[PDB]
Structures are given as structure tokens and as C-alpha cells.
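Predict the structure of GTP:AMP phosphotransferase AK3, mitochondrial.
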Amino acid sequence: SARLLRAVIMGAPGSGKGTVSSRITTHFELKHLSSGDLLRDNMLRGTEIGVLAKAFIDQGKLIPDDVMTRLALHELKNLTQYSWLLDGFPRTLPQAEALDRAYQIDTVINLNVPFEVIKQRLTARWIHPASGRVYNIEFNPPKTVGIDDLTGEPLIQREDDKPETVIKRLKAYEDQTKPVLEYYQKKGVLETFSGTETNKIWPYVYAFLQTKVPQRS
Ligand SMILES: Nc1nc2c(ncn2[C@@H]2O[C@H](COP(=O)(O)OP(=O)(O)OP(=O)(O)OP(=O)(O)OP(=O)(O)OC[C@H]3O[C@@H](n4cnc5c(N)ncnc54)[C@H](O)[C@@H]3O)[C@@H](O)[C@H]2O)c(=O)[nH]1
Ligand SMILES: [Mg+2]
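Done. Here is the predicted structure for GTP:AMP phosphotransferase AK3, mitochondrial.
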């Protein structure tokens, strides 16, 4: 690939962005950058950013743009040499306009999944905090319940996956992030995939990406 790919994946919370991203990075030559993993890492490390982020995350509110754009642009500049997949940034118009001043996004993958469906999924979500690996009791279950397959350490549930917080996160997405979908639609780069199951969507995402980025061994 002479030109490195710059891809974004977007969708309402629980639509499967991180799940699809793990499949993409498994099959395609690109690096996955997750804002949420990055924020949850900053909370473990106790950074300035990590401390102030906790209050927003735990209430289902978007972290201020100034903080998030600086964090994301800084991380991206470490990845000039790779094709990358941005997962969870941008979430607002200022975040999307800033990203554009730095990079030319090739393609924005939009997962359109029912709110009722997604609401139920986040109820059953479990994660391994150190690695960020994601599990569900129905769809991607561990071999033992509540225990990561490898470290054997407790898998946990995000504090933001409580039903009251899920409602708040969905409304924030509707109010602040959907305008970003329209921004990328008018720029000619939005590719939307609708479904209720990741496994019914993945074939189309897979075929679509074959047309944009090399495959991985
Ligand atoms: N039954 C079934 N299950 C399936 C299926 N497919 C997948 N699943 C399962 O469904 C569950 C959800 O799948 P997932 O892949 O992990 O979902 P996802 O779409 O990535 O959801 P989230 O992580 O919740 O995205 P979201 O936008 O809320 O979070 P995040 O970036 O973490 O942001 C979190 C907070 O951090 C801050 N934040 C994060 N980014 C910010 C930004 N750019 N600006 C400002 N703030 C930002 C904000 O406060 C935000 O609320 C998993 O258990 C998975 O196993 C299926 O087909 N069937
Ligand atoms: Mg995620």
C-alpha cells in the first residue's frame, strides 16, 4: 500500500465498534486505536486526564473536546507510519473538524444497530481491564464465567454499563454524535452497515474493507 489508510469506525454505544475493530485488525493491516481503552488506561495510570475523565465516563457524559482532541492527536502522531482504525474518536463536530485538519479520513464505517438491542448487550458485557478484551455472556462468552481466558484474573463490568448510564450515553450519542455522521456523509466517506447481529454485518464490512486496505497473513 503506497498510501497508508486512515479509517474511522462509529456507532451508538454497544453497536459493536470494538468487536468489529478487533476482527478488522485481525484480518487487515491496520492499527486499532480505541479512545475508551486509552481513557481506561489513563485512569489506571492516574494521569491528569485519567482523573478528570472518570467523572464524565461514570455519568455517561462526553469528555470535553479540548482534552479529547489533544489526547487523540498526540496518540495518532505516534502512528504516522501505520494504517490505523480510529474507534471512539471523533464523537462531536469539533473533534471531527480537528481530526480533518491533521489527516484525510479515507472511510468512516458506521454500525447502525437498534437501541433496544444495544441496551441489552451492554447489560451482559464483561471486560478484562488490563488488556481491554471484551466478552458477553451470550455472544462471546469466556470458558469460565467472570474470568479472562488467559490472565485468569477477574473480568469486570464497566461502571458506565449500568442501565441508567446507558440511557444517558445513548442520548448524548443522538444529540452530539449523529451530527458527525452527517458531517462525514456529506464528505462522501460514510459507509453504513445496519443489522442486529455482528455476525450478520461482518461479511459486508469484511468485503468492503478488502477494497481499501491490504489483508493480514
Ligand atoms: N448478543 C450479542 N452481543 C454482541 C454482538 N456483537 C457484539 N456484542 C457484544 O456487545 C457488547 C458491546 O460490544 P462492543 O463492541 O464492546 O461495543 P462498542 O460499540 O464499542 O460500545 P462502547 O465501548 O460502549 O462504545 P462507546 O461509544 O459507548 O464507548 P467509549 O469509547 O468506551 O466511551 C466511553 C466513555 O468514555 C468517554 N469518551 C470516549 N470517547 C470520547 C470522545 N471521543 N470524546 C469525549 N468523550 C469520550 C465518554 O464518557 C464515553 O461515554 C460486547 O459485550 C460485545 O461482546 C452480537 O452480535 N450479539
Ligand atoms: Mg468499545
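The first strand starts at residue 6 and ends at 11.
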